[PDB]
Write a protein that binds this ligand. Structure first.
Ligand code: HEC
Ligand code: HEC
Lengths: 126, 126
């Protein structure tokens, strides 16, 4: 869907911006500093689920650039494993949210965050 | 969810970027220049539906900036009418996509595009 590689870069950076907001805005909830409203979090995690599927299609062939490492493309199966595992962790977060289980939400949230960081450590330029 | 107004601006601009991609990537389909796969479009319009609900919450109080006109806030009911009407047009696009009705999709697509433009004309700085 991208006329030029720059358009893919802009897309995936914007998807990442939205994911960071929808994930990070729950930090105060998981820490107990903001109240836990199960319906609110369920809805927010549904948005995050949709968003968290979006970046990967924007690392398509020829879309090199931004702060994306070339090993994303040269090690395609490994990068895929990381994004699929991240979305697996998102599924677990969804299950926790859908159940209205705060303890499960905290745990799942931590696992998601670790998966974001693990990918950035390997595949995002400093 | 925004620590500073700049964070709201960044969010809504990123949501707009993603909406522009998910809407605009259908242009070749509506024009017949790319093939129509009903399932593909149904899925894409579901993503667009999710995205198209997102910008409005990021024009919250104190989030003035970017290319957002101040009349967004001083005429709150009027701006609301425009975003609600836009999402109404998105619902019509969803119905067309879900039905697998290409003629209905073309028509709905045009109405959505007109709604984007009508808001920008009134509420987005040149
Ligand atoms: C690999 C499988 C990733 C996972 C999982 C997550 N992110 Fe990511 N992120 C990744 C890359 C390769 C890049 C660079 C993209 C580019 O072309 O520049 C990013 C970037 C970000 C950014 C910065 C966006 C920008 O402003 O330019 C943010 C804020 C970000 N990523 C956040 C984020 C979060 C919150 C994640 C988990 C919920 C997450 N990312 C996962 C690769 C990967
Ligand atoms: C008002 C109800 C709007 C509707 C409907 C749509 N858009 Fe919009 N858009 C609006 C404003 C007020 C702004 C400026 C935001 C800011 O603070 O700068 C925008 C911006 C955009 C942009 C530019 C984003 C950027 O790169 O900075 C794009 C690409 C955009 N809008 C696209 C877009 C599309 C495709 C829409 C319909 C599907 C649409 N917008 C509707 C206000 C409104």
């Amino acid at each position: 869907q991208f006329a030029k590689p720059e358009d893919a870069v802009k897309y995936r950076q914007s998807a990442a911006t939205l994911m960071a907001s929808h994930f990070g805005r729950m930090t105060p909830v998981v820490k107990g500093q903001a109240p836990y409203d199960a319906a609110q979090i369920k809805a927010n995690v549904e948005v995050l689920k949709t968003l968290s599927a979006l970046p990967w299609a924007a690392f398509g062939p020829g879309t090199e650039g931004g702060d994306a490492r070339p090993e994303i493309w040269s090690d395609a199966a490994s990068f895929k494993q990381k994004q699929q595992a991240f979305q697996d962790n998102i599924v677990k977060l969804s299950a926790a949210a859908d159940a209205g289980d705060l303890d499960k939400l905290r745990a799942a949230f931590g696992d998601v965050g670790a998966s974001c960081k693990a990918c950035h450590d390997a595949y995002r330029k400093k």
